[PDB]
Design a binder for this molecule. Structure first.
Ligand SMILES: *[C@@H]1O[C@H](CO)[C@@H](O)[C@H](O)[C@H]1NC(C)=O
Lengths: 49, 49
């Protein structure tokens, strides 16, 4: 590619990243993040720790 | 696929013989490897000086 700054769009360089999630057969690995809220006290509550 | 390691460091009042007593070992590490294992070895620091 001889890229030049005065090229019409569709001839200018684009950078590409391809993420490929794979799942072999291990025990686990990376994943989304977790969000912890406020922890009350002295009230019947429904909790997850 | 997890390689668990428990450990404990007690002080003997001998130098190099297996003593008697009770001492429970506390978990140290956890490695989600997936590795198969059938054999193992040891590593030692030689005599040179
Ligand atoms: C470990 O070795 C056994 C050999 O019987 C094999 O069947 C097994 O797939 C190996 N472990 C993994 C995670 O592939």
């Amino acid at each position: 590619y001889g890229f030049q700054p005065t090229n019409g769009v569709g001839y200018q360089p684009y950078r590409v990243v391809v993420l490929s999630f794979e799942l072999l057969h291990a025990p686990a690995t990376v994943c989304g993040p977790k969000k912890s809220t406020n922890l009350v006290k002295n009230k019947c509550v429904n909790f997850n720790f | 696929g997890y390689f668990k390691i428990y450990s404990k460091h007690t002080p003997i009042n001998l130098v190099r013989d297996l003593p008697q007593g009770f001492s429970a070992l506390e978990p140290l590490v956890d490695l989600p490897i997936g590795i198969n294992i059938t054999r193992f070895q040891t590593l030692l620091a030689l005599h040179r000086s």
